[PDB]
mmCIF file of all heavy atoms in Angstrom:
data_model
loop_
_atom_site.group_PDB
_atom_site.id
_atom_site.type_symbol
_atom_site.label_atom_id
_atom_site.label_comp_id
_atom_site.label_asym_id
_atom_site.label_seq_id
_atom_site.Cartn_x
_atom_site.Cartn_y
_atom_site.Cartn_z
ATOM 1 N N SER A 284 1.283 12.110 17.834
ATOM 2 C CA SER A 284 1.427 11.966 16.391
ATOM 3 C C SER A 284 0.125 11.698 15.735
ATOM 4 O O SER A 284 -0.083 12.095 14.590
ATOM 5 C CB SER A 284 2.483 10.932 16.099
ATOM 6 O OG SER A 284 1.889 9.685 15.782
ATOM 7 N N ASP A 339 19.422 -1.085 13.711
ATOM 8 C CA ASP A 339 18.798 -0.251 12.661
ATOM 9 C C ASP A 339 17.233 -0.522 12.622
ATOM 10 O O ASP A 339 16.495 0.362 12.411
ATOM 11 C CB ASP A 339 19.446 -0.586 11.360
ATOM 12 C CG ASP A 339 18.774 0.071 10.196
ATOM 13 O OD1 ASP A 339 19.065 1.230 9.806
ATOM 14 O OD2 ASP A 339 17.800 -0.584 9.510
ATOM 15 N N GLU A 530 19.486 1.675 -7.993
ATOM 16 C CA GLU A 530 18.422 2.634 -8.348
ATOM 17 C C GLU A 530 18.944 3.965 -8.656
ATOM 18 O O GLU A 530 18.469 4.670 -9.495
ATOM 19 C CB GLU A 530 17.389 2.672 -7.201
ATOM 20 C CG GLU A 530 16.234 3.594 -7.560
ATOM 21 C CD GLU A 530 14.899 3.102 -7.010
ATOM 22 O OE1 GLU A 530 14.833 2.082 -6.377
ATOM 23 O OE2 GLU A 530 13.873 3.846 -7.212
ATOM 24 N N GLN A 589 15.465 -1.418 -18.742
ATOM 25 C CA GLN A 589 14.379 -0.709 -19.219
ATOM 26 C C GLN A 589 14.684 0.823 -19.358
ATOM 27 O O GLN A 589 14.311 1.471 -20.369
ATOM 28 C CB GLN A 589 13.098 -0.859 -18.307
ATOM 29 C CG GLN A 589 12.044 0.131 -18.566
ATOM 30 C CD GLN A 589 10.862 -0.076 -17.563
ATOM 31 O OE1 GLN A 589 10.252 0.892 -17.059
ATOM 32 N NE2 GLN A 589 10.600 -1.311 -17.272
ATOM 33 N N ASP A 627 8.560 -9.223 -14.622
ATOM 34 C CA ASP A 627 9.450 -8.164 -14.912
ATOM 35 C C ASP A 627 9.791 -8.298 -16.450
ATOM 36 O O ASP A 627 9.945 -7.250 -17.114
ATOM 37 C CB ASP A 627 10.702 -8.167 -14.089
ATOM 38 C CG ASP A 627 10.490 -7.466 -12.821
ATOM 39 O OD1 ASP A 627 10.210 -6.257 -12.922
ATOM 40 O OD2 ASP A 627 10.743 -8.041 -11.720
ATOM 41 N N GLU A 637 8.219 -0.473 -27.800
ATOM 42 C CA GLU A 637 7.834 0.880 -27.995
ATOM 43 C C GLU A 637 9.021 1.689 -28.669
ATOM 44 O O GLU A 637 8.818 2.527 -29.562
ATOM 45 C CB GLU A 637 7.412 1.553 -26.694
ATOM 46 C CG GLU A 637 6.600 2.805 -26.811
ATOM 47 C CD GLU A 637 7.472 4.071 -27.031
ATOM 48 O OE1 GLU A 637 8.606 4.041 -26.686
ATOM 49 O OE2 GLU A 637 6.886 5.041 -27.527
ATOM 50 N N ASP A 676 0.315 -2.331 -26.599
ATOM 51 C CA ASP A 676 1.464 -1.717 -27.178
ATOM 52 C C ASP A 676 1.858 -2.492 -28.445
ATOM 53 O O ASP A 676 2.291 -1.828 -29.455
ATOM 54 C CB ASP A 676 2.661 -1.823 -26.173
ATOM 55 C CG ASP A 676 2.333 -1.089 -24.892
ATOM 56 O OD1 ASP A 676 1.411 -0.259 -24.893
ATOM 57 O OD2 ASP A 676 2.987 -1.421 -23.878
ATOM 58 N N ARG A 679 -0.216 -1.334 -31.332
ATOM 59 C CA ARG A 679 -0.004 0.029 -31.746
ATOM 60 C C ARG A 679 1.328 0.184 -32.627
ATOM 61 O O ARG A 679 1.198 0.836 -33.625
ATOM 62 C CB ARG A 679 0.079 0.921 -30.471
ATOM 63 C CG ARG A 679 -0.437 2.310 -30.595
ATOM 64 C CD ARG A 679 -0.545 3.031 -29.249
ATOM 65 N NE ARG A 679 -1.190 2.196 -28.170
ATOM 66 C CZ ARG A 679 -0.503 1.497 -27.313
ATOM 67 N NH1 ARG A 679 0.765 1.535 -27.271
ATOM 68 N NH2 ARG A 679 -1.202 0.768 -26.416
ATOM 69 N N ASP A 719 -8.525 -0.919 -28.702
ATOM 70 C CA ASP A 719 -7.253 -0.626 -29.321
ATOM 71 C C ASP A 719 -7.014 -1.504 -30.500
ATOM 72 O O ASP A 719 -6.518 -1.127 -31.584
ATOM 73 C CB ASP A 719 -6.163 -0.685 -28.369
ATOM 74 C CG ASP A 719 -6.022 0.549 -27.482
ATOM 75 O OD1 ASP A 719 -6.744 1.509 -27.678
ATOM 76 O OD2 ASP A 719 -5.162 0.562 -26.513
ATOM 77 N N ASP A 824 -17.970 11.363 -31.751
ATOM 78 C CA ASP A 824 -17.603 10.311 -32.702
ATOM 79 C C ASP A 824 -18.807 9.850 -33.513
ATOM 80 O O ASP A 824 -18.752 9.833 -34.771
ATOM 81 C CB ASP A 824 -17.001 9.137 -32.025
ATOM 82 C CG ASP A 824 -15.474 9.080 -32.175
ATOM 83 O OD1 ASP A 824 -15.000 9.166 -33.377
ATOM 84 O OD2 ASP A 824 -14.721 9.000 -31.141
ATOM 85 N N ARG B 3 5.220 2.429 11.744
ATOM 86 C CA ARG B 3 5.742 3.763 11.485
ATOM 87 C C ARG B 3 7.142 3.844 11.042
ATOM 88 O O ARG B 3 7.700 4.868 10.687
ATOM 89 C CB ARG B 3 5.466 4.635 12.594
ATOM 90 C CG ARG B 3 5.180 6.120 12.218
ATOM 91 C CD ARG B 3 3.763 6.197 11.563
ATOM 92 N NE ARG B 3 2.654 6.106 12.506
ATOM 93 C CZ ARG B 3 2.291 7.032 13.296
ATOM 94 N NH1 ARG B 3 2.825 8.300 13.269
ATOM 95 N NH2 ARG B 3 1.164 6.891 14.115
ATOM 96 N N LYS B 10 13.848 4.590 5.239
ATOM 97 C CA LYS B 10 13.926 3.146 5.484
ATOM 98 C C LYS B 10 12.862 2.428 4.706
ATOM 99 O O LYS B 10 12.975 1.225 4.425
ATOM 100 C CB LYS B 10 13.812 2.868 6.983
ATOM 101 C CG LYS B 10 14.082 1.411 7.392
ATOM 102 C CD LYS B 10 15.440 1.013 7.032
ATOM 103 C CE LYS B 10 16.517 1.858 7.719
ATOM 104 N NZ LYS B 10 16.277 1.949 9.180
ATOM 105 N N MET B 17 9.477 0.166 -4.322
ATOM 106 C CA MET B 17 10.007 0.892 -5.483
ATOM 107 C C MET B 17 9.402 0.250 -6.784
ATOM 108 O O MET B 17 9.235 0.974 -7.772
ATOM 109 C CB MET B 17 11.505 0.814 -5.504
ATOM 110 C CG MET B 17 12.173 1.829 -4.548
ATOM 111 S SD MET B 17 12.044 3.622 -4.926
ATOM 112 C CE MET B 17 10.390 4.005 -4.324
ATOM 113 N N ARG B 18 9.143 -1.087 -6.737
ATOM 114 C CA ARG B 18 8.451 -1.707 -7.905
ATOM 115 C C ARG B 18 7.103 -1.095 -8.154
ATOM 116 O O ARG B 18 6.714 -0.964 -9.290
ATOM 117 C CB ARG B 18 8.332 -3.184 -7.651
ATOM 118 C CG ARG B 18 7.567 -3.920 -8.700
ATOM 119 C CD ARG B 18 7.095 -5.328 -8.151
ATOM 120 N NE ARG B 18 8.240 -6.268 -8.079
ATOM 121 C CZ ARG B 18 8.904 -6.745 -9.181
ATOM 122 N NH1 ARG B 18 8.558 -6.478 -10.421
ATOM 123 N NH2 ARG B 18 9.922 -7.553 -8.911
ATOM 124 N N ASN B 25 4.918 3.284 -15.613
ATOM 125 C CA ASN B 25 4.672 2.627 -16.957
ATOM 126 C C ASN B 25 3.263 2.832 -17.324
ATOM 127 O O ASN B 25 2.942 3.121 -18.544
ATOM 128 C CB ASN B 25 5.033 1.244 -16.859
ATOM 129 C CG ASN B 25 6.532 0.933 -16.963
ATOM 130 O OD1 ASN B 25 7.315 1.864 -16.783
ATOM 131 N ND2 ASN B 25 6.923 -0.318 -17.265
ATOM 132 N N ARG B 29 1.956 4.880 -20.727
ATOM 133 C CA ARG B 29 1.166 4.206 -21.748
ATOM 134 C C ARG B 29 -0.196 4.953 -21.959
ATOM 135 O O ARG B 29 -0.573 5.202 -23.028
ATOM 136 C CB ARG B 29 0.906 2.774 -21.363
ATOM 137 C CG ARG B 29 -0.344 2.172 -22.073
ATOM 138 C CD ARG B 29 -0.382 0.626 -21.818
ATOM 139 N NE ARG B 29 0.919 0.093 -21.829
ATOM 140 C CZ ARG B 29 1.351 -0.839 -20.895
ATOM 141 N NH1 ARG B 29 0.566 -1.261 -19.932
ATOM 142 N NH2 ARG B 29 2.589 -1.315 -21.007
ATOM 143 N N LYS B 32 0.444 8.254 -23.774
ATOM 144 C CA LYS B 32 0.731 7.935 -25.213
ATOM 145 C C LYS B 32 -0.540 7.713 -26.032
ATOM 146 O O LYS B 32 -0.640 8.143 -27.197
ATOM 147 C CB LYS B 32 1.684 6.769 -25.351
ATOM 148 C CG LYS B 32 2.117 6.508 -26.794
ATOM 149 C CD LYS B 32 2.934 5.263 -26.886
ATOM 150 C CE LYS B 32 3.714 4.974 -25.635
ATOM 151 N NZ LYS B 32 4.819 5.929 -25.417
ATOM 152 N N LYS B 33 -1.468 7.000 -25.416
ATOM 153 C CA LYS B 33 -2.768 6.748 -26.129
ATOM 154 C C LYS B 33 -3.510 8.068 -26.335
ATOM 155 O O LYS B 33 -4.252 8.210 -27.271
ATOM 156 C CB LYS B 33 -3.621 5.785 -25.319
ATOM 157 C CG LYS B 33 -4.120 4.582 -26.072
ATOM 158 C CD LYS B 33 -5.010 3.691 -25.268
ATOM 159 C CE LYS B 33 -4.200 2.894 -24.226
ATOM 160 N NZ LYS B 33 -3.145 2.100 -24.841
ATOM 161 N N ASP B 34 -3.355 9.004 -25.439
ATOM 162 C CA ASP B 34 -4.146 10.212 -25.407
ATOM 163 C C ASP B 34 -3.818 11.153 -26.669
ATOM 164 O O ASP B 34 -4.760 11.556 -27.370
ATOM 165 C CB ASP B 34 -3.959 11.069 -24.174
ATOM 166 C CG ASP B 34 -5.219 11.031 -23.278
ATOM 167 O OD1 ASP B 34 -6.305 11.053 -23.824
ATOM 168 O OD2 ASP B 34 -5.008 11.025 -22.033
ATOM 169 N N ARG B 41 -8.318 12.270 -34.009
ATOM 170 C CA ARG B 41 -9.535 13.030 -33.964
ATOM 171 C C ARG B 41 -9.678 14.090 -34.961
ATOM 172 O O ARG B 41 -10.808 14.569 -35.234
ATOM 173 C CB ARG B 41 -9.691 13.580 -32.474
ATOM 174 C CG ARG B 41 -11.020 14.176 -32.144
ATOM 175 C CD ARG B 41 -12.184 13.244 -32.385
ATOM 176 N NE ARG B 41 -12.579 12.614 -31.118
ATOM 177 C CZ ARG B 41 -12.469 11.346 -30.844
ATOM 178 N NH1 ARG B 41 -11.991 10.476 -31.767
ATOM 179 N NH2 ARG B 41 -12.834 10.873 -29.682
#
Side-chain angles (χ1 to χ4, degrees):
Chain A
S284 100
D339 172 88
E530 181 145 0
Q589 162 184 144
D627 274 303
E637 203 275 338
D676 303 337
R679 217 168 311 97
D719 280 356
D824 258 307
Chain B
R3 216 66 77 76
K10 189 60 62 50
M17 282 295 78
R18 173 197 288 292
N25 283 15
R29 159 171 324 135
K32 181 185 333 291
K33 233 182 289 301
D34 249 326
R41 186 58 97 243

